[PDB]
Amino acid sequence: NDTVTIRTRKFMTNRLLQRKQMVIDVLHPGKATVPKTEIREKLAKMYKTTPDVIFVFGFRTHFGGGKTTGFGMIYDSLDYAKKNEPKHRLARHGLYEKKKTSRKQRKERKNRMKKVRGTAKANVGAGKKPK
């Protein structure tokens, strides 16, 4: 924490997705890769925002420690951040849930429903028996 610094570059703003995006590098001379949460709040202090709208990813560390570079994303509002931002990053921040079944099981149910025609009760009870 004593020697960790954020530096921004390729900064630009767009109103198309209502955000400002940049590529940043953080300097840890002798420490591990800085945690994305730490980048989040430090960049929030940098741009006078809160560490709930900050979005960072793609942090690759140069050979031999020291510099690591990632792509930073800041939005004007959390509602816009929810509106246009990938669901996996929303789930990383905990704002999106993926509590669903496997792709294989989903395909099994989709193919089993094709054997039953029209009848709504037998079309919704298709996957009830072969669990």
């Binding site: 630009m12 767009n14 109103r15 198309l16 997705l17 246009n84 990938p86």
Partner: protein, 262 residues
């Protein structure tokens, strides 16, 4: 095949799209539109690879579906809409306008224009035919056709289409001594003046063009777009004024720029 193709491999994409090899297997495959897919710039790569407003196809799809991209004064939500030559791309939320013009190396460059200049657009007439009730027509280099043109307008001349009306306000005849631009082939992107036109019946006419620096080249007639009345262009030219300069005088320009910046 048993029908039309609706895929485009990444390596088989047009070279001027400046796509790489490792991102994926496929290319945008632009939808049918006013321009052929060989010389069109789809909006996905225009807003992802040229301006970096979007990082992915999904993001550029969101940008398009929020109805901010305006092409030729009309809102287009097609992610792979073929933009093409000198169609005005207007974004009002961020307030800039783009004119899609080839650079000196035959690639669509990011050319920014004022709104009062973006209000209009040059077109190259491709055919003139009279239709029913004796009504003349005019089909441009786009898919755009219009009725009741000036009878002085002939084939492969230039017309001034102002947006939001689709009408003609002025025109440039294809005449010796007029400023042109090459729209295909090796000399793509070169601004020059019509010096000669040799015509070969039953084949393609060849036009000889000299630029400002005196470099004279030639190209087929179908690759020429008249852009100026004599020597003043009717549009805003990109950087370099469409003057193709060789690698010998490109390298030392790079060295001078590096020396100035260092």
């Amino acid at each position: 095949a048993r029908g039309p193709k609706k895929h485009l491999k990444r390596v088989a994409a047009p070279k001027h799209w400046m796509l790489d090899k490792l991102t994926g297997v496929f290319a945008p495959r632009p939808s049918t539109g006013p321009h052929k897919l060989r010389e069109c710039l789809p909006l996905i790569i225009f807003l992802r690879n040229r301006l970096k407003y979007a990082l992915t196809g999904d993001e550029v799809k969101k940008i398009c579906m929020q109805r901010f991209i305006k092409i030729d004064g009309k809102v287009r939500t097609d992610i792979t809409y073929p933009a093409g030559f000198m169609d005005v791309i207007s974004i009002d939320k961020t307030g800039e306008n783009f004119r899609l013009i080839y650079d000196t190396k035959g690639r669509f460059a990011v050319h920014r224009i004022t709104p009062e200049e973006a209000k209009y657009k040059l077109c190259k007439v491709r055919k003139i035919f009279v239709g029913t009730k004796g009504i003349p027509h005019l089909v441009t280099h786009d898919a755009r056709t219009i009725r009741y043109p000036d009878p002085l307008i002939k084939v492969n001349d230039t017309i001034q289409i102002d947006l939001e009306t689709g009408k003609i306000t002025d025109f440039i005849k294809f005449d010796t001594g007029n400023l042109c631009m090459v729209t295909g082939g090796a000399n793509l992107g070169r601004i020059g003046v019509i010096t000669n036109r040799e015509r070969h019946p039953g084949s393609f006419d060849v036009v000889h063009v000299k630029d400002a620096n005196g470099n004279s080249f030639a190209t087929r007639l179908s690759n020429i777009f008249v852009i100026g009345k004599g020597n003043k262009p009717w549009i805003s030219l990109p950087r370099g004024k469409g003057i193709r300069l060789t690698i010998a005088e490109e390298r030392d320009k790079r060295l001078a720029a590096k020396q100035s910046s260092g």
